[PDB]
């Protein structure tokens, strides 16, 4: 007979009950110890609420002081969607270079879909505090109250921490910049262009400190996608209704080219869409021979079903090297952070009923 | 023969009707239902919770279910209370019948149901985290009150 009290699979690491305090996370100079934080979060360890709130608020204050359109220089590693895949985020930093000597730019979508979203926020916000001038974070369409409540990030914060941590993340997501001008060559956004954004100054005049509205320029920055037949100019309309997203627009190849020529830009770097190879390059511009649009997806094995590779753009020495990497193992979670009792109880009542009605028939 | 004592919500006609059904299931007329006699019904041969229900009905722990254990077990799964149906489900997980759901028995009961749909390491992880989030007094196990605080709002456990 197997022990009814002892853990059956003893060698499986048990998540620690110790919650990191302020002295364990922040040193005497106020710099967060990302190595202590990394090892603790990888063990599914949690922080004290006041410590987690301090990381979120101090990171939000740094983001609030930044402009809507960031001015980022090369070299830099550009990263796509993360979607709460914390253990894949650790491989990303191994693959793209240490943030202590490598410039970083994330295109948003740090939460939802994955079940380690708060760990991604806490670790990236801590790196933002530790490297405020070399690590940069943009806003995605998921860094909002509506999508985090429709998906599992709202529930995740209620399970692992509290709703005060969720509300602090929502105010922190309001401070995230919307775009980045990288090396005066590339426009870096999460989704894409907008019919109401024709110059880079149209981004500078936006009010980003709010929940993303259902329509408008700020909405299109986070939600717009390229046409499904991007490059094969069959739809002359530059912006058409995005029926896949239910909002924003599809933008065509002439739409991107008109923006790149008018603003003297080489390409547009965005994410928002999953790719099997971790990236996708679209039709090159006629004058440059460089892809006019590049999608980056940094979530390998998306939803643990796609079996897709991930990639980051490592731009250095006038070379944009696409760096692919595979997924990493992570502890298991039931969908929507459901416990085993809520999961199995309907099956218990079903099977016990099926047994008893057959023995009493 | 001295009278039989039992605690159930059945009237005399229901007890007699369940007695006739009990004799039919008792293939060897031994006065008790063995696991083999329960498994004689083809509908129970693929039910992964048969052995748990038998162990719950077997109050004296002799391995078989006599008529008293048969009546009282069926009684707890039909004019019953809301707490009685919720405690019967609690007893499904509580293998050692100590009043607390421990980590080992919660894994084994779940392993009976999930089969190979989850690896052992995955099931152990969600068993650990379930107890971590549901344990309120910090003893590493799930009491009945802690069990009700999780599955209280979940409304399906009645027979005829």
């Amino acid at each position: 007979k197997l022990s009814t009290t002892d853990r059956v699979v003893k060698a499986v690491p048990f998540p620690p009950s110790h919650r990191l305090t302020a002295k364990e996370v922040f040193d005497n100079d106020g710099k967060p110890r990302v190595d202590i934080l990394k090892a603790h979060l990888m063990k599914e360890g949690r922080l004290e609420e006041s410590v987690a709130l301090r990381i979120i608020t101090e990171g939000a204050s740094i983001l609030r002081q930044e402009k809507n359109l960031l001015d980022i220089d090369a070299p830099v590693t550009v990263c796509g969607d993360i979607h709460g895949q914390f253990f894949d985020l650790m491989k990303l930093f191994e693959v793209g270079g240490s943030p202590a000597n490598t410039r970083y730019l994330f295109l948003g979508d740090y939460v939802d879909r994955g079940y380690f979203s708060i760990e991604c926020v806490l670790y990236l916000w801590a790196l933002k505090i530790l490297y405020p001038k070399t690590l940069f974070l943009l806003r995605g369409n998921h860094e909002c109250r509506h999508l985090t409540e429709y998906f599992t990030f709202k529930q995740e914060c209620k399970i692992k921490y509290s709703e005060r941590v969720y509300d602090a993340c929502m105010d922190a997501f309001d401070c995230l910049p919307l775009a980045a001008l990288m090396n005066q060559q590339f426009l870096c956004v999460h989704g894409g262009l907008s019919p109401e954004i024709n110059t880079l100054d149209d981004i500078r005049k936006l009010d980003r400190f709010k929940e993303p509205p259902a329509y408008g320029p700020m909405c299109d920055i986070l939600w717009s996608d390229p046409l499904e037949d991007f490059g094969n100019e069959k739809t002359q309309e530059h912006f058409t209704h995005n029926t896949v997203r239910g909002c924003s627009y599809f933008y065509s190849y002439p739409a991107v080219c008109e923006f790149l020529q008018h603003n003297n830009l080489l390409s547009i770097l965005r994410a928002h869409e999953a790719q099997d190879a971790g990236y996708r390059m679209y039709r090159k511009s006629q004058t440059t021979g460089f892809p006019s649009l590049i999608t980056i997806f940094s979530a390998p094995n998306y939803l643990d079903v796609y079996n897709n590779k991930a990639a980051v753009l490592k731009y250095e020495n006038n070379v944009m090297n696409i760096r692919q990497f595979n997924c990493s193992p992570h502890p298991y979670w039931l969908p929507n952070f459901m416990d085993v009792f809520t999961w199995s109880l309907p099956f218990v009542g079903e099977k016990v009923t099926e047994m008893l009605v057959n023995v009493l028939n | 023969s001295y009278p039989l004592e039992m605690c159930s919500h059945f009237d005399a006609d229901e007890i007699k009707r369940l007695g006739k059904r009990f004799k039919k299931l008792d293939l060897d007329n031994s006065g008790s239902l063995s696991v083999e006699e329960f498994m004689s019904l083809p509908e129970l041969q693929q039910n992964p919770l048969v052995q748990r229900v038998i162990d719950i009905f077997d109050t004296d722990g002799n391995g078989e279910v006599d008529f008293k254990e048969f009546i009282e077990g069926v009684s707890q799964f039909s004019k019953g209370d809301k707490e009685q149906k919720l405690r019967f489900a609690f007893r499904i997980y509580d293998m050692d019948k100590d009043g607390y759901i421990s980590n080992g028995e919660l894994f084994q009961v779940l392993k009976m149901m999930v089969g190979n749909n989850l690896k052992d390491t995955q099931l152990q992880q969600i068993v650990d985290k379930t107890i971590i989030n549901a344990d309120k007094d910090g003893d590493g196990r799930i009491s009945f009150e802690e069990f009700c605080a999780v599955v209280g709002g979940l409304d399906k456990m009645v027979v005829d």
């Binding site: 099956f347 | 992964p48 999930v114 749909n117």
Partner: peptide
């Protein structure tokens, strides 16, 4: 006959 992952 077996509990499935939702």
């Amino acid at each position: 006959e077996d509990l499935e992952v939702p």
